[PDB]
Enzyme design. Sequence first.
Site, mmCIF file in Angstrom:
data_model
loop_
_atom_site.group_PDB
_atom_site.id
_atom_site.type_symbol
_atom_site.label_atom_id
_atom_site.label_comp_id
_atom_site.label_asym_id
_atom_site.label_seq_id
_atom_site.Cartn_x
_atom_site.Cartn_y
_atom_site.Cartn_z
ATOM 1 N N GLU A 118 -2.172 10.682 -11.122
ATOM 2 C CA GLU A 118 -1.790 10.942 -9.743
ATOM 3 C C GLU A 118 -0.704 12.022 -9.671
ATOM 4 O O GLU A 118 -0.838 13.030 -8.966
ATOM 5 C CB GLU A 118 -1.310 9.654 -9.091
ATOM 6 C CG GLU A 118 -2.416 8.676 -8.763
ATOM 7 C CD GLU A 118 -1.937 7.273 -8.452
ATOM 8 O OE1 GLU A 118 -0.704 7.021 -8.404
ATOM 9 O OE2 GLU A 118 -2.803 6.398 -8.258
ATOM 10 N N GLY A 143 -6.864 3.760 -4.902
ATOM 11 C CA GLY A 143 -6.539 2.614 -4.079
ATOM 12 C C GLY A 143 -7.396 2.517 -2.826
ATOM 13 O O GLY A 143 -8.150 3.444 -2.490
ATOM 14 N N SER A 144 -7.228 1.407 -2.127
ATOM 15 C CA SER A 144 -8.100 1.048 -0.996
ATOM 16 C C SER A 144 -7.999 1.953 0.222
ATOM 17 O O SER A 144 -9.019 2.201 0.867
ATOM 18 C CB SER A 144 -7.887 -0.411 -0.586
ATOM 19 O OG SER A 144 -6.568 -0.621 -0.113
ATOM 20 N N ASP A 189 -3.687 10.712 -1.228
ATOM 21 C CA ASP A 189 -3.474 9.502 -2.006
ATOM 22 C C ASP A 189 -2.662 8.502 -1.185
ATOM 23 O O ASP A 189 -2.139 8.851 -0.115
ATOM 24 C CB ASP A 189 -2.744 9.869 -3.312
ATOM 25 C CG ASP A 189 -2.950 8.846 -4.432
ATOM 26 O OD1 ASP A 189 -3.563 7.790 -4.235
ATOM 27 O OD2 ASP A 189 -2.482 9.024 -5.569
ATOM 28 N N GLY A 190 -2.576 7.276 -1.688
ATOM 29 C CA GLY A 190 -1.831 6.220 -1.045
ATOM 30 C C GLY A 190 -0.440 6.077 -1.634
ATOM 31 O O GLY A 190 0.006 6.906 -2.439
ATOM 32 N N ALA A 191 0.223 5.000 -1.245
ATOM 33 C CA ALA A 191 1.568 4.696 -1.702
ATOM 34 C C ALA A 191 1.851 3.216 -1.542
ATOM 35 O O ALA A 191 1.240 2.532 -0.712
ATOM 36 C CB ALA A 191 2.579 5.536 -0.926
ATOM 37 N N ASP A 192 2.762 2.701 -2.362
ATOM 38 C CA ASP A 192 3.179 1.319 -2.270
ATOM 39 C C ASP A 192 4.404 1.184 -1.343
ATOM 40 O O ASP A 192 4.562 0.177 -0.659
ATOM 41 C CB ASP A 192 3.486 0.762 -3.660
ATOM 42 C CG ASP A 192 2.313 0.887 -4.605
ATOM 43 O OD1 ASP A 192 1.153 0.642 -4.170
ATOM 44 O OD2 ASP A 192 2.464 1.223 -5.801
ATOM 45 N N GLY A 203 1.941 3.516 -8.070
ATOM 46 C CA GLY A 203 1.634 2.958 -9.378
ATOM 47 C C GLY A 203 1.182 1.526 -9.446
ATOM 48 O O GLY A 203 0.935 1.027 -10.538
HETATM 49 CL CL LIG Z 1 -1.812 3.588 -8.734
#
Ligand SMILES: [Cl-]
Lengths: 229, 229, 229, 229
Positions: free
Chosen positions: C107, C29-30, C85-88, C99
């Site tokens: 991940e 992700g960004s 890592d990222g997260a929503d 996800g």
């Molecule tokens: Cl993802």
Amino acid sequence: MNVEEMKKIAAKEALKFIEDDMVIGLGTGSTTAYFIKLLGEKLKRGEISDIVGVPTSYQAKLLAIEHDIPIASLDQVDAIDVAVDGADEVDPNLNLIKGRGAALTMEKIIEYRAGTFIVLVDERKLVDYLCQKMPVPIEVIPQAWKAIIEELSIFNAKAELRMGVNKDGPVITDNGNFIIDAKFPRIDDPLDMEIELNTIPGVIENGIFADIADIVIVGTREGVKKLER
Amino acid sequence: MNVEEMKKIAAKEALKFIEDDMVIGLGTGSTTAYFIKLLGEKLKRGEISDIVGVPTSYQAKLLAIEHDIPIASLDQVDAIDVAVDGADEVDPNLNLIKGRGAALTMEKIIEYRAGTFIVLVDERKLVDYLCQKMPVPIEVIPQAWKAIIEELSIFNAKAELRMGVNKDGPVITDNGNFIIDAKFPRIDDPLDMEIELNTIPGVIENGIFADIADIVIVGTREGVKKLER
Amino acid sequence: MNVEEMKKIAAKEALKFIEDDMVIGLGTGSTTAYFIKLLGEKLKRGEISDIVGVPTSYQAKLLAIEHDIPIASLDQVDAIDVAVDGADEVDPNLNLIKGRGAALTMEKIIEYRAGTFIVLVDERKLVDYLCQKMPVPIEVIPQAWKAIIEELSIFNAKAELRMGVNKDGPVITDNGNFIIDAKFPRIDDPLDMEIELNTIPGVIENGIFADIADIVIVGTREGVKKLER
Amino acid sequence: MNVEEMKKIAAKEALKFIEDDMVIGLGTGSTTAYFIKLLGEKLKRGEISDIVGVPTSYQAKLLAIEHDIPIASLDQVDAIDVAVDGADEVDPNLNLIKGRGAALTMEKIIEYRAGTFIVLVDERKLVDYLCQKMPVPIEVIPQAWKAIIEELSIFNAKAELRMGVNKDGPVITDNGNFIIDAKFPRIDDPLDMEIELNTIPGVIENGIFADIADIVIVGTREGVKKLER
Ligand SMILES: [Cl-]
Ligand SMILES: [Cl-]
Ligand SMILES: [Cl-]
Ligand SMILES: [Cl-]
Ligand SMILES: [Cl-]
Ligand SMILES: [Cl-]
Ligand SMILES: [Cl-]
Ligand SMILES: [Cl-]
Ligand SMILES: [Cl-]
Ligand SMILES: [Cl-]
Ligand code: NA
Ligand code: NA
């Protein structure tokens, strides 16, 4: 010299073509496994340095990992200097049949971009013509397997879906596909057969490797010999 | 009497549970293969009608096609009335180990939704406790294979990556994954071990089938015997 | 700070946790893309050395290759020291939903094995409870998609098959599977729901990442904050 | 007429070619979606019977299921009587470019074997020459993507890896592969180019469909038009 000895002598000879700072395509199968093990030993002992392997299969990749050889994907490297692999058949023009191990697709992907493609075989692999002893493995999209068999049969090939031993049902390749083994009578023009088979919808890749091998290292019964073109 | 005879008698008994208009989960392996043939024959004679099979593997699918049984994938039907499949181990509480044929994922997907799950086995599959005879197959995302094996050491699993015979390298499942066969010395709580294995990132599915089988039809050297919850 | 700067500042803070000789999980992700780029520059300038990245997606892998960071699969390394890592969504207890990019399986595979799992988010990602804003992505074996959507309705989840934009049909994950996005009104017990979902045959992973994050670095309008459990 | 109206009239005209007892290849995309709908409605009204569809994608399969059209895989049938599908471009010799929807591999597999291949398009799809408006999609083994793009430079093709919108990273096809969209200046010899691209190791299939379409039904602003070989 028995078979395993012939394989070992070929693997040992291949080491002579490997130098420091090389990216090496790592082949699949028992003969090349000897080469990977020897390469791993050389690296551990410090007899060679700065080697990276580009595996043609999970078999090659896992073996390299076990032997502490650095590994990279094809799209990770800028070029493959030398690729080393085995063959099921080698005809007098150095055209091959490969795929008994089911890894023909990644093999061709990697070996096609190699500066030098070196093939390792024991004496039994030398044939008078392709399909003298072995069928041509063909990787196919699963849904297409029956149609492709039908079509090959018209071409006078004896073609069968390869079946699992340690799984029920068909063999699944590393790419999730089926494999049809097609025994043609005798292939007089391997390169054009190789090209035109790939035009059949559903065919991913075929086991004819024509006009690609540079050096064939042959463990004969009385020692190592090399064929070149 | 012998093994194949034992398998056949269990398969024949299973026909008693099949009625017109049913959607039937079609299992994988040699015991169920007898059931699929017998079913196809009963359909051809008109003794049963309006049946549709939902295959648990390519092996089951191809066999059903050969015997002219209509088929559909799970997402094409609204219910699975009865599923019929084999097993590697059956304990006295009807917990099973499945996956020797490597089709455990699709098997559990279909059998989980079945009105009645019927298991077909010969005498040899009965055990006093799970893992008395066989390991637990575990399907895993390929890159997780090494970590999962190591993690299972807390249960003293002697876990190994399953290797191909008709391919080089690891067995690849129909879903493109690896299979690890975990030889637990014992599993005293099958249901919670099944959950535990499914909570490990990288596990697709595991071969413990607890709290799912409804009836076990056993072919014994003295005829048919059943087990039920 | 605007949104992009909030992402970037979180990424810059994560670098402080990276030391020579580490094996680093590379998120998707960004937000994490900034970290990958920054890490690559540090490596290029020699400010850090002997790093190996283990990518959680093709996106992360290709980005890392572009920035000359050595890459390896999980089974190539002996340990993951730190994963970033990222997260929503991130709830007050540091449980996450991940996800949106569809890479939740790899991940979790990598992040579960990390000595320290660091999450990077800009202010927007913080929520009062999971599912306040986003659905839980669930990766499923294609054949099981319909049954799983029906089964989730029991818990009052509004679940939909994720559809492609740059392909017709369903989104396909890197592992060849489908994604169902399940919107629960709220998830009061993330870990238990996470486990329950993974125990459904056909579910191979879900986007609830409970009890796994060690540090959440939040880029805010004024600076960076670090949240710990 | 607008585009949706053009699509619908082409679809209606196609129905006329469908007869009782036919096995029909079911194309992918919006234009064919109308056909599938109409076919389902005709079947429901009893106006046609004993039809079986063979879907070229999950999209086509799911739509057929929703419209209660019986379906089967290619390996389940002995022949495809008629295949109906759309196209991204149709040149004056009825050569096509397909694959915007990413389903080109299964499309060619099914359409190659069809007694009659009927293409449905609206006005916009007609071109003076292939690549006038759209690139050629090429499905490739993921690891080979970079090498293949580089190799495509000898055709002066502008080639790019197709990226996901509802996933991060590259679009994944139903077969687990990547797609490269290659914009060639123009293709003067479609069949030759179709063959050449499939000879590249790593290329699964390409979007040129030469010497395969039998009839092209075009919805235009002035009514339906039927082009034939
Ligand atoms: Cl993802
Ligand atoms: Cl091979
Ligand atoms: Cl199978
Ligand atoms: Cl099995
Ligand atoms: Cl095997
Ligand atoms: Cl392999
Ligand atoms: Cl997309
Ligand atoms: Cl699709
Ligand atoms: Cl398409
Ligand atoms: Cl990706
Ligand atoms: Na898969
Ligand atoms: Na595949």
